[PDB]
Ligand binder design. Structure first.
Ligand SMILES: O=C(CO)[C@@H](O)[C@H](O)[C@H](O)CO[C@H]1O[C@H](CO)[C@@H](O)[C@H](O)[C@H]1O
Ligand SMILES: [Ca+2]
Length: 556
């Protein structure tokens, strides 16, 4: 039997707002993405995940949707969306879209009606509760600052919002609401969408009665919001009434949920989701407040990957990513973005990303080795989540503004949202106007045009790796085995399928290191290396590794 197309596919995440502008408004659009499909094809990309593209007031840049069946005005029209589809299909490429159905915008017609009165037909499309003892219904905190409950004077009741105040949560306990969501999903699937990514999929179910969070739960409220009693009931239903009738791939963003519960989401026998986005790895060095950083080693890095691989079992599947629109740049976060180590480390992380077991996602710009942004003003940090950090930590005296910005500089979501660097023209060729966010000044050295013409560039190395994975089934669907989980210098693991075994070795130190193969293992061939002066001799039992050297080898 064969493996599904998505298990051996290489995905590329486009954040349309910051990818390519074509009308000089400073905002990326659909026409921009369409003009760059050849670039993505040439890289070797099989499928594209785009961030929300629906009508939105943009208080959270598309994650506050005011009309699920209309296209965001900034990105273009429905015609532009269809053309994007058609141009993708002509290149044998597939499209995955973002599905945001934990909540909607407060400008959605459902909510405008819902808030009108207690007897409105749409009232139960959301959660409305009376205050308690002169205060909020309960002690729920919002991800984006303050209470998760917001009072509305129109009726005197509070509505629930896990995130932004302009992002009220949808009530999945209401059957009529679920049917509306299902019909909306079919609407896009009938248009030929090949994949769906479910944003904060683990929070769909709310706990009956909304009791107060215990002191312990209050600490880790992200986890507590993923413990709704009817969650998997709703996910199985959505599969039965929607995805069972189509051949699209489903990807869940499982944020807040402990690893041991992930199988419930991705076990194919359960008929829920196909693969999972987990955040144990990408947040392995983030503190509980989601803005402080905690020092970690390669040991912690690889042991997390191990635990994540183990919950796949035989019937489940993982995605793999080192960066997205919500996190700092990969080379800055996991590598060394200093000008003498940036390219080398970026190539090293590319080797990891494309030799992991699971479906790899590459975030726009990482193939160029783009870096974190050098923030210098208040404005640079402008984001709804940072506004919330101010509300919860600065205005309350828990921390000074400078303390917040010092740490957020390393963790800000805006680090990943600076305009794609196409060339070295004005604003890196992203726009002919003023970009909605400032272009990283290092675009003079870091841009696509220069990378594409250089066989030693980061882009060329990614492109080479993508070709190798596509021609080596073991590197996609093969099994995973960490050689030494306790090693903090050199990351090494094997990929095996059908008698074929491959070895991956990556030095994470900016210093020369040595690696010794397991007893009875020898190098047969060298597929690729970065920062290496010479491939090992055939039959070698060990490797001499340069600083930040990475490689892939077929072994005996
Ligand atoms: O914003 C975050 C990342 O730093 C998290 O607090 C967030 O809870 C989580 O990453 C959820 O992700 C998705 O849901 C949000 C929708 O409200 C949106 O802000 C994120 O961009 C989207 O990725
Ligand atoms: Ca535009």
């Amino acid at each position: 039997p064969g493996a599904p197309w998505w298990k051996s596919a290489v995905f590329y995440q486009v954040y349309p707002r910051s990818f390519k502008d074509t009308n000089g408004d400073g905002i990326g659009d659909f026409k921009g993405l369409t003009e760059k499909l050849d670039y993505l094809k040439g890289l070797g990309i099989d499928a594209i995940w785009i961030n929300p593209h629906y009508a939105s007031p943009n208080t959270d840049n598309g994650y506050d949707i005011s009309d699920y069946r209309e296209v965001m005005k900034e990105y273009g029209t429905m015609e532009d969306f269809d053309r994007l589809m058609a141009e993708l299909k002509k290149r044998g490429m597939r499209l995955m879209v973002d599905v945001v159905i934990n909540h909607s915008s407060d400008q959605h017609e459902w909510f405008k009606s819902s808030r009108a009165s207690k007897d409105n037909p749409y009232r139960d499309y959301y959660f409305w509760r009376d205050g308690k003892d002169g205060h909020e219904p309960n002690n729920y905190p919002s991800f984006f600052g303050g209470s998760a409950w917001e009072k509305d004077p129109v009726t005197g009741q509070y509505y629930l919002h896990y995130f932004g105040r302009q992002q009220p949560d949808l009530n999945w306990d209401t059957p009529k609401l679920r049917e509306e969501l299902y019909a909306m999903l079919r609407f896009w699937l009938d248009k030929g969408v090949s994949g769906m990514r479910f944003a904060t999929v683990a929070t769909y179910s709310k706990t009956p009665g909304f009791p107060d969070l215990t002191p312990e739960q209050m600490k880790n409220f992200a986890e507590a919001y993923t413990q709704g009693p009817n969650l998997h009931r709703y996910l199985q239903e959505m599969h039965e009434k929607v995805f069972d009738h189509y051949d699209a791939v489903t990807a869940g963003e499982i944020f807040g949920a402990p690893l041991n519960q992930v199988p419930l989401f991705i076990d194919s026998r359960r008929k829920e989701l196909d693969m999972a986005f987990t955040f144990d790895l990408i947040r392995y060095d983030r503190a509980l407040d989601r803005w402080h950083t905690i020092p970690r080693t390669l040991a912690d890095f690889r042991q997390t990957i191990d635990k994540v691989d183990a919950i796949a079992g035989e019937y489940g599947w993982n995605t793999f990513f080192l960066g997205n629109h919500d996190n700092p740049r990969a080379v800055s976060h996991f590598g060394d973005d200093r000008p003498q180590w940036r390219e080398a480390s970026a190539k090293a992380l590319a080797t990891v990303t494309l030799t992991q077991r699971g479906t790899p996602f590459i975030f726009q710009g990482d193939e160029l080795g783009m870096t974190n942004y050098p923030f210098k003003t208040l404005q640079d940090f402008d984001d709804i989540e940072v506004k919330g950090f101010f509300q919860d930590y600065v205005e309350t005296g828990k921390a000074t503004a400078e303390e917040l910005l010092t740490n957020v500089a390393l963790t800000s979501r805006n680090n990943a949202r600076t305009p794609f660097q196409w060339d070295d023209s004005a604003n890196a060729g992203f726009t002919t106007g003023k970009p909605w966010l400032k272009v990283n000044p290092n675009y003079t050295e870091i841009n696509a045009a220069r990378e594409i013409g250089d066989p030693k560039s980061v882009y060329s190395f990614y492109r080479n790796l993508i070709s190798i994975r596509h021609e080596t089934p073991a590197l996609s669907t093969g099994s995973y085995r960490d050689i030494d989980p306790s090693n903090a210098d050199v990351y090494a693991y094997t990929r095996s399928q059908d008698g074929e075994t491959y070895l991956v070795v990556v030095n994470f130190k900016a210093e020369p290191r040595s690696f010794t193969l397991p007893d009875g293992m020898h190098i047969a061939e060298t597929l690729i290396e970065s920062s290496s002066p010479a491939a090992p001799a055939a039959g070698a039992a060990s490797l001499e590794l340069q600083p930040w050297q990475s490689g892939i080898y077929k072994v005996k």
